[PDB]
Each structure stands twice: as C-alpha cells, then as structure tokens.
Amino acid sequence: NLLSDKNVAIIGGGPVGLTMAKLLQQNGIDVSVYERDNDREARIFGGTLDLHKGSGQEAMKKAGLLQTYYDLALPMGVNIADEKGNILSTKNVKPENRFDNPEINRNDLRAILLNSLENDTVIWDRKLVMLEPGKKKWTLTFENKPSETADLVIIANGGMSKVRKFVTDTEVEETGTFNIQADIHHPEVNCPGFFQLCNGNRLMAAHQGNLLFANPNNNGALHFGISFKTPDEWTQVDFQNRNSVVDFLLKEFSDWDERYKELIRVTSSFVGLATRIFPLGKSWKSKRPLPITMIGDAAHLMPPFAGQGVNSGLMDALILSDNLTNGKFNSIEEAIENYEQQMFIYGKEAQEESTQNEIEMFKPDFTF
Ligand SMILES: Cc1cc2c(cc1C)N(C[C@H](O)[C@H](O)[C@H](O)COP(=O)(O)OP(=O)(O)OC[C@H]1O[C@@H](n3cnc4c(N)ncnc43)[C@H](O)[C@@H]1O)c1[nH]c(=O)[nH]c(=O)c1N2
Ligand SMILES: CN1CCN(CCCN2c3ccccc3Sc3ccc(C(F)(F)F)cc32)CC1
Prior knowledge:
Number of strands: 17
Strand order of the largest sheet: 5-4-13-14-15-12-16
Function: An FAD-requiring monooxygenase active on some tetracycline antibiotic derivatives, which leads to their inactivation. Hydroxylates carbon 11a of tetracycline and some analogs.
Bound molecules: dihydroflavine-adenine dinucleotide, the ligand CN1CCN(CCCN2c3ccccc3Sc3ccc(C(F)(F)F)cc32)CC1
Subunit structure: Monomer.
Strand content: 25-35%
Subcellular location: Cytoplasm
Pfam families: FAD_binding_3
Binding site for FAD: 50, 106, 297
Helix content: 25-40%
C-alpha cells in the first residue's frame, strides 16, 4: 500500500543497494538502481565478503538467494604467522560450521544479485550528482544524462557519498590508519613461498605496528592488504608509481621474512586507501522535504577491522524493505524512521567494535 503507484530510486548498485532492490522488487515495488559504473563487466577490486547468519545471510534467505550464495562461497581457515614466517596458530573450518560465514568473491556476489533482478532494473553509467525535492517527487540529476523522478530515494552509494545532506550533515572522517591492497595472479608461481605459508588458509601477521592480511584464493588470485598508522610525514607515496610503493613497503617490512618481501617485490600495482568512518552520533535530520534515507556504507562506513561492514548494510536492506512492504506503517516517512532507529543501535555497536579493534590492533605490542 505504501508504494502502490509510486517508484523507488536506489542510488548505487553495490551489494547493499542491489539487495535493497531485490527485496523491494520481489514485493511488486517499482524500483530502479542508478549505478555509476559504466557496465556490469567492470571488475570490483577488493577481498572477499562473508555473509553472517541473522544478518547478511538473512537478507539472502529472504530474497531466495541463500543457496545461490552457498554454492559460490568457500569457508576458509585462518593462520596467524609472525614476521619471521612461523605459524603461531592454525584454525580450519569444522564441517558443522561450513555455513557460518563462507567467503564469496565480490564479483560473484554482484552477479548473484544482478541475475536475481528483472531486466533493466539497474541503469548503468548513471552517476547521481544532485537531488531536488519537488511537490511530491524527487528529481534526480545525473552526470551528462537525462534526469529521473522518484517518490522515494534510498542512498546506497558507499562511504564517500556526496548526496547525503538531505539526511544528515555528518561528514566522513579519517581514522588515522592507512591501507595498501593488491592482487597477485598465479600466486603459486609468483609468490610461492608466501602461498605455501598460507597453505589454503587466510593469513594474518602483525609486527611493530604493521599488519598484513592475505587470502590466497580469491577466484584464483591472492589478495593481500597491509595496514599501519598513517605516517606523520604524509601522502609522500605515489600509488601510480609501483617503484615508489615497493621502496616504502620494503623499508617498513625490512625485518620480515623474505616470503613476505617477495610479495611486495612481485606485485604489479598497489591501491592505497586511508581508513575512514562515517560516525553515527546525534539523530539524522527530522521532517525531511520528501522521503529519503540511506543504507550500507553511505549510512555507517566503518573501519574494516571487525568484519561488520557489509553485514550491517545487508541488515539495513532487510529492515527497510520489510517496513516499506509489511503494511504496518501509515507513511513512508514512518517506515523509514523505524528502520533508522533500529540501525542506529546495531550500527553504533558495530562502529564501536570496529573502532575498538582498530585502536587495539595498532598498538606497538599487538598480537593476534
Ligand atoms: C580494505 C577493506 C576491506 C573490507 C571492507 C572494506 C575495505 C575498504 N569491508 C567493507 C565492505 O566491503 C562494505 O561495507 C561494502 O562494500 C558496503 O557496500 P555498499 O553497497 O554500502 O557500498 P559499496 O561501496 O560496495 O557500493 C557503492 C556503489 O555505489 C556506486 N556509486 C558511488 N557513487 C555513486 C553515484 N554518485 N551515483 C551512482 N552510483 C554511485 C559505486 O560505483 C558502488 O557500486 C568489509 N566488509 C565485510 O563485511 N567484510 C570484510 O571482510 C570487509 N573487508
Ligand atoms: C578473521 N577476520 C577478522 C577481521 N579481518 C580484518 C582484516 C580485513 N582486511 C583488510 C583490512 C585492512 C586493510 C586491508 C585489508 S585487505 C584484507 C585481505 C585479506 C584478509 C583476510 F585475512 F581475511 F583474508 C582481510 C583483509 C581479518 C580476518
């Protein structure tokens, strides 16, 4: 009843926005996703995602996609190593826990979600640049493309979103840590020592404030990340110049075993990213001119040290879609308010845990 003869615009087709769209569409809602990516073949850079029972997996189950996820996800164990390459502990996944949070490639998750939507639900090459509330509909302005209208706008376009001001004046913050990520293709050949160290498990190591994480099998590539407190001199490293990054990393990792150094020396290109947070604090704006809200990283971007990132976003989509379709609310505004009040609770909890882990993980003495 709330959305009958109305349409919904979701801004951003990340995992959270696409899940949003599926959950609305399967209830007969007219919904479009506007995604800035030029088309669906653009690869998504990054590590794997794990969906949790009761949150991310509950969104997939409601959508009819839980088995689809299971079929493309891998449970993976964890090895903790020290800087010398000694395995300090090894924890494999017991078979009764194979469904707790198996890891899925981000492109596979995207494909699962896109395949679940009706044709032309996602409108590619649509970068939203501005919103304007009319008498009853939002007008959406896109970069060099014709405008569109919607009764309800859901901001789902990630942590650096510039279209949040109708919802909140909160600004994204840097937390003081920095991340460098890279993929190694054919790792069994190109970083064989480190690949054997992982031994089919994820690997984590920490030494003198420098952290290293690796997944040796993300659809055949090894993905790794290195994190550290942002240096005071900084960004004096040009991530377009691999020689500049290799030089910086080899100094920081000078005391690490050569299996780690070879990882750095053979990487083709590096991606640098300051850690950021979009902090939940005082309430969002009340009495907005037309119905609008935010989900996912746009709502509560958070340091990736607690593993709660995408799962809290998928809970947003589950809660918001239920409120918009369960027939219990007298207005779209009230369904939104109910979602936001719930999400401020679990969102603040996740953000606190992420921020606490971050403080603790970068203390000079930290051990996993
Ligand atoms: C290094 C690192 C490591 C991890 C993680 C992050 C980082 C940086 N995370 C966090 C997790 O990946 C994150 O929570 C999700 O990607 C959030 O998904 P969203 O769909 O909200 O945003 P996401 O950023 O994925 O999607 C936003 C979409 O909007 C599009 N877009 C942006 N601006 C637009 C515009 N103006 N108009 C239209 N479209 C626009 C983008 O192209 C993109 O498709 C994580 N999480 C987790 O659960 N487990 C983990 O292990 C990790 N690990
Ligand atoms: C158990 N689980 C606890 C929480 N996460 C936090 C690390 C997330 N992540 C990361 C974090 C900061 C900077 C870069 C990266 S890339 C990356 C690569 C592999 C793994 C890896 F190791 F998971 F495969 C994890 C990460 C680590 C593993």
